[PDB]
Amino acid sequence: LLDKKWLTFALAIYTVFYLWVRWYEGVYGWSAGLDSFAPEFETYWMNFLYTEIVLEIVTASILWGYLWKTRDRNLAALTPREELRRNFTHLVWLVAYAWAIYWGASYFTEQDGTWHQTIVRDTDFTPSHIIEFYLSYPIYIITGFAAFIYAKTRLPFFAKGISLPYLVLVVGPFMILPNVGLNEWGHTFWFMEELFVAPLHYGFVIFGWLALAVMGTLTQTFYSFAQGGLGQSLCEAV
Amino acid sequence: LLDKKWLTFALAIYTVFYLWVRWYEGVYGWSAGLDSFAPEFETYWMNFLYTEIVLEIVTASILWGYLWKTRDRNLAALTPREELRRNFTHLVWLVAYAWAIYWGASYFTEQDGTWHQTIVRDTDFTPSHIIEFYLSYPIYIITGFAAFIYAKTRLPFFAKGISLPYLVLVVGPFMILPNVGLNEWGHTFWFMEELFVAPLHYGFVIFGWLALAVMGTLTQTFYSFAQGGLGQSLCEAV
Amino acid sequence: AVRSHAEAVQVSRTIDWMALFVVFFVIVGSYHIHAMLTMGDWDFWSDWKDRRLWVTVTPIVLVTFPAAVQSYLWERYRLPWGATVCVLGLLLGEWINRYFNFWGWTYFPINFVFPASLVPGAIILDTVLMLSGSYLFTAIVGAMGWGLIFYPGNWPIIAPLHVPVEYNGMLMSIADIQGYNYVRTAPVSAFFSAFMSILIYFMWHFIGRWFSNERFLQ
Amino acid sequence: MGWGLIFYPGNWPIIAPLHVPVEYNGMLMSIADIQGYNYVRTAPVSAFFSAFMSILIYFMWHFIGRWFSNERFLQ
Amino acid sequence: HGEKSQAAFMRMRTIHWYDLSWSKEKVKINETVEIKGKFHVFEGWPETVDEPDVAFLNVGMPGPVFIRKESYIGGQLVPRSVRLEIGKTYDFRVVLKARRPGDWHVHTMMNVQGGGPIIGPGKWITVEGSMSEFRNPVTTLTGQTVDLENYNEGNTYFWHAFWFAIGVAWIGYWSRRPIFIPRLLMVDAGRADELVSATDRKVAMGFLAATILIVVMAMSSANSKYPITIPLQAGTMRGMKPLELPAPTVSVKVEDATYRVPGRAMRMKLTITNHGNSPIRLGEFYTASVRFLDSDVYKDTTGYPEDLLAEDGLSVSDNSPLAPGETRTVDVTASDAAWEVYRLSDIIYDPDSRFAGLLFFFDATGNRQVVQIDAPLIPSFM
Amino acid sequence: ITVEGSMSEFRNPVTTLTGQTVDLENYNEGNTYFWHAFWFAIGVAWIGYWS
Amino acid sequence: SWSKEKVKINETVEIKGKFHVFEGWPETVDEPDVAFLNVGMPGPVFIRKESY
Incomplete structure (x- = not known):
């Protein structure tokens, strides 16, 4: 009844997973992860890559696949009682997104930042690259989409047309593929050194600012709460 | 009756003041104003600065303070007979602004231009800087505001909402603080020399172009004349 | 308020003068700041009035205001002196400065620090827009003229400064000697500048639409 | 304006101890210098400038934020 | 004036001036004063200062209180910019003619390209006399001998007045009529186009044709007198002779x-x-x-x-x-x-x-x- | 090259032209922390007050 | 020096000589940090087999 600790899943699922990761690199950062031309890299680190990409395509196909088919067809008439329960679960999806972004855009990002300072890169595939770009980012993008779709398929208001701020919020993440990938790409001609002030990194900054579309998304979410028959009891009682 | 030579004040008040200034530097440009590390600079020129800044904050507070409180409360019903007298005094304020801008943006500006050519600056506080930036500019900005406020508080039409061209016309001046101050600021890395073509000066050009909002302000002023019951006698008699 | 349609003529007249003063000095002020700020001082020195850079940048950087105030005084008053008012503002503003400061204040000859002559162009702009009242037309042949005319427009002032002198073993033009003495601290160029003025007149025609804007806020 | 100006004085209590002079092997260096030198990786006009600049940036971004507040739907 | 405020180490490690000499301490209008000396470009030139690939041998004074008649680095006259070479020592010689009565602190300075006027020592020199006495005569390869103080002054003025007047003439012509509030309203309700007519558009093209005409007439008239003219001579002199030190x-x-x-x-x-x-x-x-x-x-x-x-x-x-x-x-x-x-x-x-x-x-x-x-x-x- | 021992053993002492001898490993650490916490708290205090 | 003035298709002609880069090189010309030894002709009326 109402909004459960199905939420506690959402918070701990990343926390545990990513804390296992931080341990995992923590021990193989040094050991295998230093010299990429050693065969212990092609097993502890490269295989890790292929594993995750595959797992991501799959879970993405399953996760989006699931929700799009369990899209509520008879949305036209379902109670305000559930138009709340659902609105709340949607908010859990957003907490999961925001948490997922934290890890990607703050944690593993500025971590890679430190890593560059301490070893000259042997590949575009350092440990922290395997984790920052090809694990961390796909995850928060998948979470992103999930939420979007949940809202579109589960709640009226959001079922009517496309939310521009919500589209920007989930597509910005996805556009950071080359944006953050041009980091090392762009910086190679004029200056190969990974200077974060270089124009090559400006795409990451622009796509990072698309996270501010969360403000427009939350405004629309709270308007979906008010349309669903809420915000009138205690609001008027105030 | 109608529009007085309270105007003659407006024209001569700057003229006298600034002609006294031009004399004043004229004699102390050479003598004290050459070597800033001499104690005759800290008296004839630095004290001049502190004096003016204080006088400006004060007169600005008094001048705007005055008019905002003597704002016509019962504006709703006052005659076209005075809706003209007032419209005219407003126009005097604009003549005072334009005159004040002349001195700031043309006179003392291109003067400082000559000064730079003839001595290498000892401070960001040369005589012509004390006068160009911290005397000349505050004055025309204060005049600017005055006019704006007069219009807002004294004339219907302008009392309804905010005139965008008039806001641009008086705020542009104020924004030129750093704009014209980046003149010497910006030009210090790539090239310290005060090259006016340098990107450091582009803010002064952009804020100088906001003076073109006078055309939108005058169009609105003449529309305020036509709304106040004017432009129908001789206009239709033509 | 308004008594007779004859006094009404008198107010509109005493307005005309007051407004003109505003319009004119507010131009002089802001237009001058613009010349200044977007310049490396070719206008200041007789020995920076060259065939490439002076001839190219000057008409281009200066079409701006004319273009903008043209888009207002003609559109809203059919007053076809938009360009030439601007130009006169800059010129007065500069002369007053060059005379009382460049000469009066610090002592540079006038034959050295005189400004560039600007009227011819502004007349072409003003008249071309007036006849065939199409802005697009002005932007193309009007700005064309403004650009082209500029150098020939200065040539009668400039030419005497370009007589050759063997100064201490080196060829120099008078103008050179001037800059050398008074101590501070090639018609493709024309075409370029005309071709460029077009995009600038154009861009600034629309910038001027905005400065004509009459909204209120909140 | 404030945001810009306050910044450096705002860091000064943290920073200052790092700027004590040391003669390190014959060369003047501040502690901070020695730190970067040791731990191996691989002037209030400045303030004013930064304040003056923040203004155009606050301003430009005030409107950028209008767009991210935008509430439309699509098709 | 203007050193002092500039960075103390820039001043120490940029150009060293020595064997400075000044031919006179007090001088009459139109008289000469000659500055000589040597300068070394310091081998450890600061990074913040573009190497002197394009430098200029200037004079540090309050404007043309003197005019620079001649300047020499090595043997060579130096009216252009010049390329000086780090490490090397050169001898210079500036020759100044006095123009404005007073007390001047004259310095010898380098215009050191990318960021910096490099100001040498300044010495106080006094000019006695009247500015009205000053002459700056120069003989052209064209026969004529002119005074640079006033050469071409009247011409400059004429052409500016003439054109200025024509600008006024144009606004003048339109301003015989009322300018704003009637013309504004006419445009508004109903069409404008009564505002401008025939007697107007003839004058418009009068001006337009008159202008192009006068420009071209004037130009090839200016070409008729003054048929011999060169472009501004410019461009950095290379090959500066440095001093051979034991x-x-x-x-x-x-x-x-x-x-x-x-x-x-x-x-x-x-x-x-x-x-x-x-x-x-x-x-x-x-x-x-x-x-x-x-x-x-x-x-x-x-x-x-x-x-x-x-x-x-x-x-x-x-x-x-x-x-x-x-x-x-x-x-x-x-x-x-x-x-x-x-x-x-x-x-x-x-x-x-x-x-x-x-x-x-x-x-x-x-x-x-x-x-x-x-x-x-x-x-x-x- | 192989390092034997404990990181807890490491010292980086430096004597200033100001008299004092400090350990660069930890010099000014507590200060840094204080000022960041203090200001951080005040940021929280402000949102706290409204929340 | 030019080894021949008249030549048959598929035949060789060899140009030799010396060049001095002038000490007072003009400012408007980037120093020859990256220069290329080319041939001035109307296209491949000859092909450059070798250059030294």
């Missing part, structure tokens, strides 16, 4: 060099070691235009500016003759108010606490050796 016979080594916080003096511990064959003594340390002398050893006669010459500013712990072959370590102190007055003491705000100077050594019969020193200079507060 290898110095003394070599010095700077071990630590310190200055006191609130102070007026810089100490340095030098190991002077005298190769070559005559007992040598130290007579001067030149640093940033400021010259510190041991007057037991050397005495300026050139009338070097009084605020920059520290008559016995320089004290050596042991300044006895240093025998040939002998080598000693000595403590040297350069001390004088000029150290605080010209703000070399402002090195404490600089991001690069390193100094640079010239030491001058003199043997028994009074011929001299110039060694250059540079080193880090470290503060001491406690």
Whole structure:
């Protein structure tokens, strides 16, 4: 009844997973992860890559696949009682997104930042690259989409047309593929050194600012709460 | 009756003041104003600065303070007979602004231009800087505001909402603080020399172009004349 | 308020003068700041009035205001002196400065620090827009003229400064000697500048639409 | 304006101890210098400038934020 | 004027000026004063200063209180910019004609390309007379002899007035009529186009044709008189002849060099070691235009500016003759108010606490050796 | 090259021209922390007050 | 020097000589840090087999 600790899943699922990761690199950062031309890299680190990409395509196909088919067809008439329960679960999806972004855009990002300072890169595939770009980012993008779709398929208001701020919020993440990938790409001609002030990194900054579309998304979410028959009891009682 | 030579004040008040200034530097440009590390600079020129800044904050507070409180409360019903007298005094304020801008943006500006050519600056506080930036500019900005406020508080039409061209016309001046101050600021890395073509000066050009909002302000002023019951006698008699 | 349609003529007249003063000095002020700020001082020195850079940048950087105030005084008053008012503002503003400061204040000859002559162009702009009242037309042949005319427009002032002198073993033009003495601290160029003025007149025609804007806020 | 100006004085209590002079092997260096030198990786006009600049940036971004507040739907 | 406020180490390690001389201290309008000397571009030129690939030999004065008649680096006249080469020493010679009565502090400065006027020592020179006396005559390759003070002045004026008048004439023509509030309203409700008509558009093209006409007439009229004309001569002179200096016979080594916080003096511990064959003594340390002398050893006669010459500013712990072959370590102190007055003491705000100077050594019969020193200079507060 | 021992053993002492001898490993650490916490708290205090 | 003035298709002609880069090189011309030894002709009326 109402909004459960199905939420506690959402918070701990990343926390545990990513804390296992931080341990995992923590021990193989040094050991295998230093010299990429050693065969212990092609097993502890490269295989890790292929594993995750595959797992991501799959879970993405399953996760989006699931929700799009369990899209509520008879949305036209379902109670305000559930138009709340659902609105709340949607908010859990957003907490999961925001948490997922934290890890990607703050944690593993500025971590890679430190890593560059301490070893000259042997590949575009350092440990922290395997984790920052090809694990961390796909995850928060998948979470992103999930939420979007949940809202579109589960709640009226959001079922009517496309939310521009919500589209920007989930597509910005996805556009950071080359944006953050041009980091090392762009910086190679004029200056190969990974200077974060270089124009090559400006795409990451622009796509990072698309996270501010969360403000427009939350405004629309709270308007979906008010349309669903809420915000009138205690609001008027105030 | 109608529009007085309270105007003659407006024209001569700057003229006298600034002609006294031009004399004043004229004699102390050479003598004290050459070597800033001499104690005759800290008296004839630095004290001049502190004096003016204080006088400006004060007169600005008094001048705007005055008019905002003597704002016509019962504006709703006052005659076209005075809706003209007032419209005219407003126009005097604009003549005072334009005159004040002349001195700031043309006179003392291109003067400082000559000064730079003839001595290498000892401070960001040369005589012509004390006068160009911290005397000349505050004055025309204060005049600017005055006019704006007069219009807002004294004339219907302008009392309804905010005139965008008039806001641009008086705020542009104020924004030129750093704009014209980046003149010497910006030009210090790539090239310290005060090259006016340098990107450091582009803010002064952009804020100088906001003076073109006078055309939108005058169009609105003449529309305020036509709304106040004017432009129908001789206009239709033509 | 308004008594007779004859006094009404008198107010509109005493307005005309007051407004003109505003319009004119507010131009002089802001237009001058613009010349200044977007310049490396070719206008200041007789020995920076060259065939490439002076001839190219000057008409281009200066079409701006004319273009903008043209888009207002003609559109809203059919007053076809938009360009030439601007130009006169800059010129007065500069002369007053060059005379009382460049000469009066610090002592540079006038034959050295005189400004560039600007009227011819502004007349072409003003008249071309007036006849065939199409802005697009002005932007193309009007700005064309403004650009082209500029150098020939200065040539009668400039030419005497370009007589050759063997100064201490080196060829120099008078103008050179001037800059050398008074101590501070090639018609493709024309075409370029005309071709460029077009995009600038154009861009600034629309910038001027905005400065004509009459909204209120909140 | 404030945001810009306050910044450096705002860091000064943290920073200052790092700027004590040391003669390190014959060369003047501040502690901070020695730190970067040791731990191996691989002037209030400045303030004013930064304040003056923040203004155009606050301003430009005030409107950028209008767009991210935008509430439309699509098709 | 304008040094002092500029970074103390820039001033120490950029250009060294020495053997400066000024032919006169007081001069009549139209008279000449000649500045001579030498300058060395310091080998350890600062990064923040573009190398002098394009530098210009200027004069440091309040405008044309003098006019520069001639300037020479090496043998060559230098009206253009010139490429100077790091490490090298050159001799210059500026020749000034007096124009404005007064007291001028004239400096010799370098226009050092990418960031910086590099200002040398300034000396006070007095001009007596009337500005109305000044002439600047020049004879062209065209026959005529003109006065640059006023040449082409009237012409300039005419053409500006003429065109200015025509600008007025145009606004004038339209402003016989009422300008704003009627013309504005006419445009508004109903069409404009009654506002401008025939008697108007004839004048429009009158002006338009008249203008193009007068421009072209004027131009090829200006081409008729003045048929011989050149373009502005410009472009950096390369191949500046540097001065051929004999290898110095003394070599010095700077071990630590310190200055006191609130102070007026810089100490340095030098190991002077005298190769070559005559007992040598130290007579001067030149640093940033400021010259510190041991007057037991050397005495300026050139009338070097009084605020920059520290008559016995320089004290050596042991300044006895240093025998040939002998080598000693000595403590040297350069001390004088000029150290605080010209703000070399402002090195404490600089991001690069390193100094640079010239030491001058003199043997028994009074011929001299110039060694250059540079080193880090470290503060001491406690 | 192989390092034997404990990181807890490491010292990086430096004597200033100001008298004091400090350990660069930890010099000014507590200060840094204080000022960041203090200001951080005040940021929280402000949102706290409204929340 | 030019080894021949008249030549048959598929035949060789060899150009030799010396060049001095002038010490007073003009400012408007980037120093020859990256220069290329080319041939001035109307296209491949000859092909450059070798250059030294």
